[PDB]
Amino acid sequence: VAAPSVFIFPPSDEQLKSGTASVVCLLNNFYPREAKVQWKVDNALQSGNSQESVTEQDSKDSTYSLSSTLTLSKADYEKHKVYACEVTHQGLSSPVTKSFNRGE
Amino acid sequence: SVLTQSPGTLSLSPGERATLSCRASQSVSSTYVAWYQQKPGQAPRLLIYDASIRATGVPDRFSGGGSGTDFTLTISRLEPEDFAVYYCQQYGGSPFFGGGTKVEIK
Amino acid sequence: CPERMAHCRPIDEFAQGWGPITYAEGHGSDQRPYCWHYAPRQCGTIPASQVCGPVYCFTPSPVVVGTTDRFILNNTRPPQGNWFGCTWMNSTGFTKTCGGPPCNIGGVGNNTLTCPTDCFRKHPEATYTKCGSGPWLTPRCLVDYPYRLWHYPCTVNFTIFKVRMYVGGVEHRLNAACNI
Amino acid sequence: QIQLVQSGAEVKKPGSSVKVSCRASGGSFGTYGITWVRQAPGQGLEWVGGIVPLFDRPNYAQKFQDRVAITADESTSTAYMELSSLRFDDTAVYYCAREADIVVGGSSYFDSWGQGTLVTVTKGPSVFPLAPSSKSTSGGTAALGCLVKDYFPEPVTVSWNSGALTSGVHTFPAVLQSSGLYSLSSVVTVPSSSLGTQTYICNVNHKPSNTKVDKRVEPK
Structure with missing residues (x-):
């Protein structure tokens, strides 16, 4: 029933030049305001920097949208090649792992 | 926190009295205080300097006073054109402004 | 001003402060104090015999200090007591001055300024209370007193003003004569 | 005087x-x-x-x-x-x-x-393109957006195509960063005929900095 849909946004080609690469996870069409997002780098569960934002309301149903930003400096970006965004949510429907499998 | 104004926000109606207070903290200040007035956007104006001497152009309604500490600015016969954010400062060797009361004439 | 104001020195004397500022006592007694380019000396026990006329001395607020002897001024800054310095006319038309150690500014130049007062521009750090000796508040100002024209007769054209000085925490209301 | x-x-x-x-x-x-x-x-x-x-x-x-x-x-x-x-x-x-x-x-x-x-x-925003890069989504619906960051004064307005595509525009609330500069990520879902042809331009107006930026976003 209105399970979340996952989208992944890497950093801009100009962002790396400017530094402070931000990787964004987006969740769409979930009815309950309840969701846990794990930003797994390789096997590390980073928690230092992960900002979450949620839409107010849809005026027709409690279908919010989630945006989770993981920030990391350009120097830390290299020597590193998988990034990832695991979601556990009321409508679990088993976990879905749509991972950004390249560091490019 | 040297000079502060207790009443904070205030609200009255024409034909009333308001007595703002500026509480010098420790030093008597040698009787050096000045009072101002700021309309909603225009520039500030000087009403009283030394807490007992009146400038030119302001009526006698703005009667200021004080001795040693706790200087006061008494506004009698409030008019609609008296809304402002009044200020108190002490000059001399320790210059510093005070807090701004928020008279809400209406 | 016969041979007095003609070529004393510019009010914007060259050279500046190369760094830290020191205290010096050059014992400057060469000519009469015609202009502000001077270096007074510290005088202790003086013989109160040749002194004539008023002995006004500058706290800066001028005060008449009569000699405690007849036929004595240990100069010290007001924070430590006494007065900054002062001058007197004595004997046959000879004027003399005394004051705290002439405040010198560390720097280079042929005629580096032995700052007797103010001189902020040449040295951003030069406050009268710490670097002043005589009655000159600033290179173009004096503390006007009745004998000011009897001591510096080259300052007639100057205009008087009312000023409020703050030395330490003490407040001095005084009249000062400056030109424009 | x-x-x-x-x-x-x-x-x-x-x-x-x-x-x-x-x-x-x-x-x-x-x-x-x-x-x-x-x-x-x-x-x-x-x-x-x-x-x-x-x-x-x-x-x-x-x-x-x-x-x-x-x-x-x-x-x-x-x-x-x-x-x-x-x-x-x-x-x-x-x-x-x-x-x-x-x-x-x-x-x-x-x-x-x-x-x-x-x-x-004020510090004007630095707009960046959030591309739909997936390398394997040979299909229809996909999500785009225009990431915004590094602007202290809060107000910001995000539009699309000089005003269009009002059905699908989400503009999330600003979230503080460690440096104290706000951030934003306005996203959109649009089935562009399963083709990138239209000029997807996001007009980011930030009046306090007196700058407006037009960024075009498309798969690389």
Whole structure:
């Protein structure tokens, strides 16, 4: 029933030049305001920097949208090649792992 | 926190009295205080300097006073054109402004 | 001003402060104090015999200090007591001055300024209370007193003003004569 | 006693220096002091400093030392204040007033004031493209957007295609970062005929910085 849909946004080609690469996870069409997002780098569960934002309301149903930003400096970006965004949510429907499998 | 104004926000109606207070903290200040007035956007104006001497152009309604500490600015016969954010400062060797009361004439 | 104001020195004397500022006592007694380019000396026990006329001395607020002897001024800054310095006319038309150690500014130049007062521009750090000796508040100002024209007769054209000085925490209301 | 206070820098950038002028018309310049006092949008007045252009020694408040300079040009009867190392808190209006009496080492009360010059300190946003790069979504619906970051003043407006695609535009709330600069990520879902052909332009208007950016986003 209105399970979340996952989208992944890497950093801009100009962002790396400017530094402070931000990787964004987006969740769409979930009815309950309840969701846990794990930003797994390789096997590390980073928690230092992960900002979450949620839409107010849809005026027709409690279908919010989630945006989770993981920030990391350009120097830390290299020597590193998988990034990832695991979601556990009321409508679990088993976990879905749509991972950004390249560091490019 | 040297000079502060207790009443904070205030609200009255024409034909009333308001007595703002500026509480010098420790030093008597040698009787050096000045009072101002700021309309909603225009520039500030000087009403009283030394807490007992009146400038030119302001009526006698703005009667200021004080001795040693706790200087006061008494506004009698409030008019609609008296809304402002009044200020108190002490000059001399320790210059510093005070807090701004928020008279809400209406 | 016969041979007095003609070529004393510019009010914007060259050279500046190369760094830290020191205290010096050059014992400057060469000519009469015609202009502000001077270096007074510290005088202790003086013989109160040749002194004539008023002995006004500058706290800066001028005060008449009569000699405690007849036929004595240990100069010290007001924070430590006494007065900054002062001058007197004595004997046959000879004027003399005394004051705290002439405040010198560390720097280079042929005629580096032995700052007797103010001189902020040449040295951003030069406050009268710490670097002043005589009655000159600033290179173009004096503390006007009745004998000011009897001591510096080259300052007639100057205009008087009312000023409020703050030395330490003490407040001095005084009249000062400056030109424009 | 007419202070034709000239505008300085209405809009500036963090870390920059600002020079604010004040011209005195009439009277004898070189005998009365000029004082600079600032007030934030809504706050109390703060004494910035003052000068008397006869005793060349400006006075500065305790908290505005080693960061503010004040100068006076008598040949043109003008007083300038140079403030360096600007900060986002410096947004305020700076007035120019006359000291009633000469004071050395102190201050005084201000008789006649002058027009205030606004001083806005802001950092314009840096828009970036959030591409739909997946490398394997050979199909229809896909999500795009325009990431925004590094702008202190909050207000921001995000649109699309000069005004269009109102069905699918989500604009999330701003979230603070460690550095104190807001961030945003406005996304969109659009089945563009399963083809990238239209000009997907996001017009990011940030009026306080007086800049608008048009960024085109498409798969690489």
